[PDB]
Amino acid sequence: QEPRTLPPSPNWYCARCSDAVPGGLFGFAARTSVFLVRVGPGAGESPGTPPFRVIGELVGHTERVSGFTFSHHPGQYNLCATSSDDGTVKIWDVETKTVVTEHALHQHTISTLHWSPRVKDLIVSGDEKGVVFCYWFNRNDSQHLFIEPRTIFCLTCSPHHEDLVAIGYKDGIVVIIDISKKGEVIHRLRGHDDEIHSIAWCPLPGCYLATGSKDQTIRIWSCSRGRGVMILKLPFLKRVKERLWLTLHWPSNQPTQLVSSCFGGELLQWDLTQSWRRKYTLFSASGQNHSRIVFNLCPLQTEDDKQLLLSTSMDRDVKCWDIATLECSWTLPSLGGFAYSLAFSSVDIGSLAIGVGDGMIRVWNTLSIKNNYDVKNFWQGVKSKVTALCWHPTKEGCLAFGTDDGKVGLYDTYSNKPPQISSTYHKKTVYTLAWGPPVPPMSLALYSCGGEGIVLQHNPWKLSGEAFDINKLIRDTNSIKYKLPVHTEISWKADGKIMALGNEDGSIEIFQIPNLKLICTIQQHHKLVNTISWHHEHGSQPELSYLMASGSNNAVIYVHNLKTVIESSPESPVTITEPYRTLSGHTAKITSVAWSPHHDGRLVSASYDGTAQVWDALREEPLCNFRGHRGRLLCVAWSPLDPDCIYSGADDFCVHKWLTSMQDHSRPPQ
RNA sequence: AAUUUUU
Structure with a gap:
């Protein structure tokens, strides 16, 4: 007596085409749509069955959805923004599943977008050409920024600074711009030799930054010092060249820990306290793991106060991980x-x-x-x-x-x-x-x-x-x-x-x-x-x-x-x-x-x-x-x-x- | 397994 939906596969090779918000709502870009999944006690599932349910689909885009971002502002958790190969950025209302407002400001293929964690109505998007648009949907304001003639792979608004945005490029360059200063580059972070797959800001203030790269390292930068503080090399584990996508999840609950993706889609929790030992822990120590690389990791906190982590993968599976047990x-x-x-x-x-x-x-x-x-x-x-x-x-x-x-x-x-x-x-x-x-x-x-x-x-x-x-x-x-x-x-x-x-x-x-x-x-x-x-x-x-x-x-x-x-x-x-x-x-x-x-x-x-x-x-x-x-x-x-x-x-x-x-x-x- | 896949 319950409808089920076998969805299309989450899209590959996008830095942020999936997100989640408290109270158990997850969204992931599949094909030319975004699928919404309720997870946790509010799914209403029968006991003894996984507490998740597919409940909605965001229909509207003409082309492959490349990016997806939830509003994380309290009271605004229902709004979210998407990016598409059709050149459009759309604000959506998940309650009604319709388009609140859209824009067509980019003149080139959009790479990613991010909803600002400090400005309710600000969404920042960037394209392969290097153009970045700051868009305030409340009064349709827009800012056109060009930082560098380099391909953008990812972008992440600072959680503590409304004007601070971090941008990662295909050539391995990472820069930090200020929106007030016409995207003036405040810091230029050089160290990576390959494309930047994800940028994660330290959840606490005092300004650390984490980056993950195809060069198989994870770098931790100091925004005050402007240089890297710590370098992590992905391990080689059991079970020609191996595909790799290296995304990162920096849990608010454990500022010390860092969870990034590894070869074959293994997941890893890094203990930053043991920096010199460089300790890591493999998710699901005891076939629950992904068999192909993982593109996205999304933290979800249920109303039960249970901390979960959704992963998206080339192997066409969406997996939910319990953070406490590191199990699937x-x-x-x-x-x-x-x-x-x-x-x-x-x-x-x-x-x-x-x-x-x-x-x-x-x-x-x-x-x-x-x-x-x-x-x-x-x-x-x-x-x-x-x-x-x-x-x-x-x-x-x-x-x-x-x-x-x-x-x-x-x-x-x-x-x-x-x-x-x-x-x-x-x-x-x-x-x-x-x-x-x-x-x-x-x-x-x-x-x-x-x-x-x-x-x-x-x-x-x-x-x-x-x-x-x-x-x-x-x-x-x-x-x-x-x-x-x-x-x-x-x-x-x-x-x-x-x-x-x-x-x-x-x-x-x-x-x-x-x-x-x-x-x-x-x-x-x-x-x-x-x-x-x-x-x-x-x-x-x-x-x-x-x-x-x-x-x-x-x-x-x-x-x-x-x-x-x-x-x-x-x-x-x-x-x-x-x-x-x-x-x-x-x-x-x-x-x-x-x-x-x-x-x-x-x-x-x-x-x-x-x-x-x-x-x-x-x-x-x-x-x-x-x-x-x-x-x-x-x-x-x-x-x-x-x-x-x-x-x-x-x-x-x-x-x-x-x-x-x-x-x-x-x-x-x- | 293979796959920058989405007829």
């Missing part, structure tokens, strides 16, 4: 491509496979009591966009996948093995996979449909063996010498006695089990058919299994009843020109349709119009419309455990789990 309280996984596919296993209830465009299958254990985002990654053998997924009907852990390259493979979810790869490769992208009875000349066979329109029948147990093109059986059995339509969808009836094929011309053909005799042809659709779905067998009316839903590049959805024609098994093929039911309201093509396992005659549709709609197919009534995605939907799967609950993925790198009863709208937008 929870991890939030993320997607790095479009959610092309969504498949719920019949044998293993709860397990939902996700075909992602980053070339990695995710398996999400929806059933987990202890973990709401319990997701296992399968990258072996994929390496290509996963465009199609289909669980095995009987065998558990057996997962069939298809790729943009036309490759079809068979994964063992339970094993650590690489998947078996079918020797036969589709010429185009694999649109759909389906399990059904074997056909000549070949227990269950695996059927793959290529974007070139060829349906192939592979041997699951001898995937190395040549797959057979089903068109040959269709021609021989039905005595058909005309050129067969190119197939775009393959679907089996629940009994597996009937196979439906959808073709690029929009027609749909129905075949009988033994040797694929053509029983009937349906010509409702006038564009390529993307999706066909048969109704489940367990229902108040027995004849309900004969209902077939159909989705094409037109927005209209058709339902057909095939009990009359299937029962007749006529010697000569029958053509249906009239639909049993007509589902009208989408605005763009239909990518996927799915009948509900819990209710008779209830269909969910996904569409390029960016919405999913649920229908009572029998009364041709639109029940509810889900508008949470910000892109085109590609796939829908009904929850097999909850009747009100649906999963959809879209081209916005998002999977949403939403409740039919929670939607505010009945029908798709006009």
Whole structure:
């Protein structure tokens, strides 16, 4: 009864594209949005489950968000500012999730921005050209500063001095400017030999400064003396050149300690008291750690007075760290491509496979009591966009996948093995996979449909063996010498006695089990058919299994009843020109349709119009419309455990789990 | 694992 959101991956190589504020609110730049996560007691989570929840998304930017900064002024914790490759800096209100005000002052790509800790309405941003804008949103004032012709990597307002800002550059230079003095350089800090990844000011006054660099050192500067006081060299730890991003977190609670990032995304707490010994402590001493570099660290203090630290990483995980134990309280996984596919296993209830465009299958254990985002990654053998997924009907852990390259493979979810790869490769992208009875000349066979329109029948147990093109059986059995339509969808009836094929011309053909005799042809659709779905067998009316839903590049959805024609098994093929039911309201093509396992005659549709709609197919009534995605939907799967609950993925790198009863709208937008 | 990735 709780909606969940699998978000896009936090953006890489940004000095500050994630922040957090007291009372458990965290924000991180993913793709062209910022995602807000409530963490701590106020998340309202059930006990025994990580106390975090995705609650909001900041939609508005046209391009990659490069920077994100919360207001840390008491009473103003709801406002935040972002930066984007679209040249704009936007002030946001998290309560309403809308843009308070924006500016387009930078003339070059923005590097980072920072909300001033001493001026309520002052946000300072800087670009790759070296230009810095001081912006006071209260009365739209603006200051244009140029310090040096060098690329800015990071910038950090002094916490004790309103006029003091620290700027770190790609060449390793670090300078401290005064805003009152037209960004006059007060101090120039030379020592680093490589790009500056983060600047952290001492939380106490009396003016120390910490900098982290690709040159694998952390420097502590004295702003009064203007020179470095202490140099730290990142250690080499167990488990060619290694990528490194070196960010720093200087905890107010422990002024003595410093926590920076290390190779492979290890985290380190440095004890500055033991300067000469140069002691450090490794986070999670006892696979809870990141497997790739960490870009951002965000302190979060919950209302419980528990001190946490959120980390963002190239490994596409957001991790929450408890500062007291140095252990990982929870991890939030993320997607790095479009959610092309969504498949719920019949044998293993709860397990939902996700075909992602980053070339990695995710398996999400929806059933987990202890973990709401319990997701296992399968990258072996994929390496290509996963465009199609289909669980095995009987065998558990057996997962069939298809790729943009036309490759079809068979994964063992339970094993650590690489998947078996079918020797036969589709010429185009694999649109759909389906399990059904074997056909000549070949227990269950695996059927793959290529974007070139060829349906192939592979041997699951001898995937190395040549797959057979089903068109040959269709021609021989039905005595058909005309050129067969190119197939775009393959679907089996629940009994597996009937196979439906959808073709690029929009027609749909129905075949009988033994040797694929053509029983009937349906010509409702006038564009390529993307999706066909048969109704489940367990229902108040027995004849309900004969209902077939159909989705094409037109927005209209058709339902057909095939009990009359299937029962007749006529010697000569029958053509249906009239639909049993007509589902009208989408605005763009239909990518996927799915009948509900819990209710008779209830269909969910996904569409390029960016919405999913649920229908009572029998009364041709639109029940509810889900508008949470910000892109085109590609796939829908009904929850097999909850009747009100649906999963959809879209081209916005998002999977949403939403409740039919929670939607505010009945029908798709006009 | 690979990846300055974001079709």
